[PDB]
């Protein structure tokens, strides 16, 4: 069973772009926005979800550090961005309910089973095609737009 | 050079005659001449002590060195043309047939 550590980010929001947020440590493997919207939809009585920010993943298997931890030009923790104060308070109530369900009177088996996305051979070698031959169309367009 | 080849480079440079001038003699003062030769020695040494002999002759074929000498000396006195008139390899210390067949 994978365990999620969920706190509110509200006591530390000075910046406008990060309001109505959940600060979540020990996020599951390959955790994306589709699995998080499936999470808040599997939650009963929960509204809508926008985007996972700060997803520069740092757990599933070995490393020195992440990928873009530093900004070279100039702690695997998720930042969950809700839609409204109603949506964030209802997902808070629902995840408090899920936290309390470890001693639920039916049994502790009512939790959601974390279904991972298995990294396939073709998508692994699509990352290889990203290593070797990206699309020259997008490469030329990006380099011209950054060179102009 | 890098391959322990000791070599002498003799470069020759003729003074530019500037367009829109009336004075017939384009003489440079001896201080300008010594400064220009100093810059020439600097440029040749800086672009001949960084590379190997194959890179040196790949530089010697299209005459990059005289071009860079003109480009860096035209500020002290313009030069009509800068050639490398002699290149003498004095001592070869090695017999590396590996590098020789690598060339060939």
């Amino acid at each position: 069973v994978h365990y999620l550590y969920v706190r509110r980010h509200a006591p530390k929001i000075p910046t406008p772009t990060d309001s109505r947020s959940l600060f979540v440590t020990n996020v599951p493997v390959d955790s994306t926005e589709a699995h998080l919207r499936a999470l808040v939809t599997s939650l009963v009585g929960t509204g809508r979800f926008e985007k996972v920010t700060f997803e520069d993943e740092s757990k599933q298997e070995h490393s020195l550090e992440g990928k873009s931890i530093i900004d070279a030009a100039q702690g695997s923790t998720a930042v969950v961005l809700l839609a409204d104060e109603k949506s964030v308070e209802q997902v808070l109530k629902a995840i408090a309910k899920v936290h309390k369900t470890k001693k639920y009177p039916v049994w502790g088996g009512d939790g959601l089973p974390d279904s991972k996305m298995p990294p396939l051979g073709p998508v692994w070698l699509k990352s290889h095609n990203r290593l070797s031959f990206p699309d020259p169309s997008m490469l030329q367009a990006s380099v011209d737009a950054f060179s102009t | 050079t890098t391959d322990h080849y000791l070599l002498r480079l003799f470069a020759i440079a003729f003074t530019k005659r500037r367009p829109n001038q009336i004075k017939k003699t384009t003489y440079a003062q001896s201080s300008q001449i010594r400064a220009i030769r100093r810059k020439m020695v600097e440029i040749i040494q800086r672009e001949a002590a960084s590379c190997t002999l194959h890179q040196l002759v790949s530089k010697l074929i299209p005459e990059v060195i005289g071009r860079e000498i003109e480009k860096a000396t035209q500020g002290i006195y313009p030069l009509q043309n800068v050639h490398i008139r002699k290149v003498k390899l004095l001592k070869q210390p090695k017999f590396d047939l590996g590098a020789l067949m690598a060339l060939h």
Binding site: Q60, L64, P122, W124, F133 | -
Partner: protein, 1061 residues
């Protein structure tokens, strides 16, 4: 150097010194009592051979007739036993130059016989020697009679010499002050009783080398203008004369030890030298022992130069270091190791240098010291003295702990020869006749095989250049016993004579396919028809014309993978001229990853033609001639395919392979239009690379395919994009652009963001990562190519150690520059071994140096610190500290890759497996059980995941171009081809070809480690898991949790998969 050598020799003698209580009274008290006993031994009358037999048949004591024993039809004299005339001491006891030896030493007791007993003809026909045998028979018989059976006695030879039988006393127990003295093990472990001759009894002019002193044949032995018809017997003459002049040489040594102050410690250093060389005064190791070193010291003190000048660094007032280093130099060059075999000779006082005749001479005694000095051990001493002169001439590194080890006589190609010499008329192709029986002292077959291996392994160029496929040779009679019991007359043996062949090779001549001959004229020459050629070779000799416009009767060898032309010549020449006696050396190390080409396995051709020649034409010249906005300046491939260090040599085609994407750095000329931000810098780099690709894809070389792709090994920079280009020979290359402002831009990045306080080490890390992969690998490949040309076995040795790290799952955490710098240490600083001409030799020296390399106090600085060591006393960050004049801080290849290093990681696994492989090659030997040394153990791993991937049969090996897994038929031939492997889509199915374990393990190994760390087969540098997808391996992910995880408090900078308590 001088004061350091003096103080460390002082500490060595303080360690190896002796105790005066062990001397007096153990040795002196039992010397006094054995002296009294040999004085009370009573005399015996004149007896013939029949009376000697009738005396010694009923006794448990028996005589010792050396081959051959005298028959009563030849023995005309009669033998007796008088009182012992003289009792004296020879060896190093009375000189007191002995030191603490752990194994054994024996002080030589000398019983000089009287003079009236022998007749003036006794020097001929073995007469005096059999008289000496009967004398020692009576001496030791009455010795046991008076010793009543309390001590241990045994028969031995003096230094293995077959014609001098001696007695050896060994104490059986020990007490405080009694006659039992076991506990002292140097001067009291054994006492050697030896019968000897008086001074100047027999004619020393007859005891010259040039005469044969046994008379076997008499017809045809005359009318030959002097005496060349009688075969001269240098060994037996030298035995008679050395027995007769042992005492005068004790006097000579005594006077030289009196004259020179540091003479004793000079012999001390030389005895340490010979014991570490393995050399000694024994006849089975060249005879260069303690007495030979001391007499060389004596003659070199009393002269040695050509004009009889007293040699300059050997005045008798000098020190031990000067005397030892001067004997090193004079044994290294002048007339003392191999010149006294080929070119030069020595003479006694006043000593001089004379350039003719092989002798180490003493004219006052008519004696050759070098009678046990064969040419093989002689040239062995020559290379050891020359190399050690080079060392003791060097003035940089401390060099006392390097004392030589005998790889030249015990290499990996130590050939076991099991041959039986019975009966000799059928079981040997060479006849053992009475002339050779006189001449050679039972090392006759050893001498014959020495000469046959030399003349089988000798080459000869047309221009007078004498090179051979060997440099040094050694024939060892394995399991030779020097001691036999009292009850048997010779040394009995029934297991035969196993011969160990040990060779130090010429590396540039070890693989030359032609075996050259002489120039064949209109008539065949004496050398053409001699025992070096046509008659010695038989069917193998054939006329071959070379490109040098000269015909020659040569021989041609065929290039094969798992063995050598040395193996072929050795098996053929031994099975031909000695006998059918079997040869075996089956050490399997050439059976590594075998490429796919024509005439497998290729020489240095798949490294030149496949990468280097294809990159010259067409890549280098096209990208040099092509026109740009900014002209090209510099193109440097950094690759192991340049510097001869890829695990698999590159063949045509294999985009599937690890080392095939070939990294090339490219520098432009100086310009300022490049911007001041990393993103604008690297995208303008991609723009220049884009116009490069545009010209290459427009030009007539448009069949060459090109593409641009990102990079991930340099962290936190999402804009490194290189030009991966595929030539029509399938030759794939990575093209990157380097300017001058990137090192300073990363300097800026290391300088800024000081307020956060926790980014400086990763900023230094990315800075020195750029430093390793943009200029230091260019200089690295330049220097390592220039060294790999002069060092030929460095290429298979780096192949071997990379394959060992690949089967032990280590070369992902360890970069290849360290591997090549380790083999570069063991080839370019090879002390105290030789430069390995053999790949298995280089590999075993790598494994031994890593089993002994205590990484705490000793860093590895090679010839191609006190701050990092005080900053890390526990070495959690770096295990190996390898420096060069190339890179001086020792940090460009360990700290920047940043290996996790407690006592339970990959690096500790490296050193522990090194100790394990060394221990098992010690206690099991060299056999087919090296599959232990090349199969991982997979012990001490927490979680092990067994990975096999979605591939068909024969994959990936036939497309990495390697051929294990015989399910692919025809691996010996060119059944596989790659012009169909050049794909139609650079999109899938071209990236389909890659194997999941590599980049699964890579992105794996780029997300966690703050919890755990694994080893596997994937990101092993320049390595795909092909040969480890066989019986030689698996795919594994073996992960161990970090020692900083047992339990911890909750905190946001945790990262780990954790559960609450």
């Amino acid at each position: 150097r001088a004061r350091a050598f003096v103080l460390e020799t002082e500490e060595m003698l303080d360690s190896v010194d002796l105790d005066y209580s062990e001397a007096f009274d153990g040795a002196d008290a039992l010397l006094h009592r054995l002296k009294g006993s040999i004085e009370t031994i009573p005399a015996h009358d004149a007896q013939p051979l029949l009376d000697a037999a009738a005396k010694l048949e009923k006794k448990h004591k028996l005589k010792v007739p050396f081959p051959s024993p005298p028959p009563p039809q030849n023995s005309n004299y009669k033998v007796s036993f008088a009182t012992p005339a003289q009792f004296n001491v020879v060896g190093s006891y009375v000189a007191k130059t002995m030191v603490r030896t752990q194994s054994a030493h024996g002080i030589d007791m000398i019983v000089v016989l009287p003079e009236s007993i022998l007749q003036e003809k006794d020097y001929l026909d073995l007469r005096y020697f059999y008289k000496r045998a009967y004398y020692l028979a009576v001496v030791a018989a009455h010795l046991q009679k008076d010793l009543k059976g309390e001590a241990t006695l045994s028969y031995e030879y003096h230094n293995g010499n077959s014609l001098l039988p001696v007695l050896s006393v060994k104490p059986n127990g020990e007490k405080d002050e009694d006659e039992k003295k076991k506990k002292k093990g140097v001067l009291d472990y054994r006492i050697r009783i030896i019968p000897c001759a008086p001074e100047s009894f027999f004619p020393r002019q007859k005891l010259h080398l040039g005469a044969g002193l046994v008379r076997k044949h008499k017809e045809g032995e005359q009318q030959a203008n002097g005496q060349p018809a009688t075969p001269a017997t240098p060994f037996y003459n030298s035995t008679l004369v050395a027995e007769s002049s042992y005492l005068q040489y004790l006097k000579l040594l005594r006077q030289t030890e009196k004259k020179c102050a540091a003479f004793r410690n000079a012999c001390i250093l030389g005895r340490i030298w010979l014991q570490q060389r393995g050399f000694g005064s024994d006849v089975s190791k060249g005879g260069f022992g303690y007495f030979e070193w001391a007499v060389l010291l004596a003659l070199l003190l009393q002269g040695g130069p050509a004009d009889t000048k007293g040699a300059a660094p050997l005045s008798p007032s000098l020190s031990s270091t000067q005397l030892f280093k001067a004997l090193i130099q004079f044994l290294s060059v002048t007339n003392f190791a191999e010149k006294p075999c080929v070119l030069g000779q020595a003479k006694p006082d006043l000593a001089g240098f004379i350039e003719n005749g092989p002798i180490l001479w003493d004219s006052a005694r008519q004696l050759n010291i070098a009678f046990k000095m064969g040419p093989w051990s002689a040239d062995l001493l020559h290379q050891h003295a020359r190399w050690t002169r080079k060392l003791l001439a060097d003035g940089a590194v401390d060099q006392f702990q390097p004392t030589f080890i005998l790889k030249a006589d015990l290499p990996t190609h130590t050939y076991d020869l099991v041959a039986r010499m019975d009966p000799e008329k059928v079981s040997e192709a060479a006849p053992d006749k009475v002339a050779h029986e006189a001449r050679g002292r039972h090392w006759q077959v050893g001498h014959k095989v020495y000469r046959i291996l030399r003349r089988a392994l000798s080459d000869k160029n047309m221009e007078g250049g004498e090179r051979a496929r060997l440099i040094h040779l050694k024939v060892s009679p394995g399991f030779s016993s020097s001691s036999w019991s009292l009850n048997e007359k010779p040394q009995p043996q029934k297991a035969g004579t196993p011969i160990e062949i040990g060779v130090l090779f010429d590396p540039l001549n070890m693989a030359r396919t032609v075996d050259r001959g002489p120039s064949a004229g209109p008539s065949a020459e004496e050398k053409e028809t001699c025992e070096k050629f046509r008659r010695f070779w038989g069917e193998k000799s054939e006329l071959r014309r070379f490109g040098g416009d000269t015909i020659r009767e040569t021989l041609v060898w065929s290039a094969q993978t798992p063995f050598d032309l040395c193996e072929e010549i050795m098996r053929y020449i031994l099975g031909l001229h000695l006998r059918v006696g079997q040869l075996q050396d089956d050490i399997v190390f050439y059976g590594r990853s075998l490429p796919a080409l024509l005439s497998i396995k290729p020489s240095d051709t798949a490294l030149f033609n496949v990468a280097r020649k294809t990159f010259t034409s067409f890549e280098r010249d096209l990208r040099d001639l092509e026109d740009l906005p900014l002209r090209i300046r510099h193109v440097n491939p950094i690759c192991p395919e340049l510097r001869h260090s890829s695990l698999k040599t590159p063949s045509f085609g294999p985009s599937k392979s690890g080392p095939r994407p070939m990294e090339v750095v490219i520098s432009f000329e100086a310009s300022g239009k490049w911007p001041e931000s990393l993103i604008a810098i690297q995208r303008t780099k991609i723009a220049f690379l884009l116009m490069i690709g545009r010209l290459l894809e427009r030009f007539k070389p448009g069949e060459i395919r090109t593409h641009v792709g990102l990079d991930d090994a340099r962290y936190e920079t999402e804009n490194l994009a290189f030009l991966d280009v595929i030539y029509a020979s399938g030759a794939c290359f990575r093209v990157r652009i380097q300017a001058d402002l990137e090192e300073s831009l990363l300097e800026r990045q290391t300088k800024d963001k000081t307020t956060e306080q926790y980014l400086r080490q990763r900023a230094s890390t990315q800075l020195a990562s750029f430093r390793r992969t943009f200029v230091h690998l260019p200089l690295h490949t330049q220097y390592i190519t220039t060294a790999t040309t002069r060092f030929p076995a460095l290429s298979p040795t780096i192949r071997l150690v990379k394959h060992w790290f690949s089967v032990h799952k280590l070369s992902n955490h360890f970069p290849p520059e360290l591997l090549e710098l380790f083999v570069l240490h063991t080839f370019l600083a090879p002390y105290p071994w030789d430069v390995p001409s053999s790949p298995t030799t280089g590999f075993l020296r790598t494994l031994l140096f890593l089993a002994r390399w205590d990484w705490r106090t000793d860093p590895l600085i090679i010839d191609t610190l006190d701050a990092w060591r005080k900053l890390d006393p526990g070495m959690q960050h770096t295990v190996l500290f390898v420096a060069t004049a190339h890179e001086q801080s020792g940090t460009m290849w360990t700290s920047v890759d940043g290996h996790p290093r407690p006592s339970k990681v990959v690096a500790a696994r490296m050193t522990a497996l090194a100790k394990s492989a060394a221990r098992v090659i010690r206690e099991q030997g060299v056999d087919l059980d090296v599959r232990r040394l090349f199969v991982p153990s997979l012990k001490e791993y927490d979680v092990l995941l067994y990975l096999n991937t979605k591939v068909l049969k024969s994959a990936l090996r036939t497309y990495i171009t390697v051929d294990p897994a015989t399910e692919m038929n025809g691996g010996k031939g060119q059944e596989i081809k790659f012009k169909n492997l050049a794909p139609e889509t650079v999109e899938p199915p071209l990236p389909v070809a890659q194997h999941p374990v590599d980049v699964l393990l890579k992105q794996l190994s780029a997300v966690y480690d703050s919890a755990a760390g694994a080893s596997g087969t994937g990101p092993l540098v320049f390595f795909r898991s092909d040969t480890t997808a066989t019986e030689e391996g698996d795919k594994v992910i073996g992960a161990v949790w970090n020692p900083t995880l047992v339990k911890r408090k909750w905190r946001v900078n945790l990262p780990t998969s954790y559960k609450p308590v």
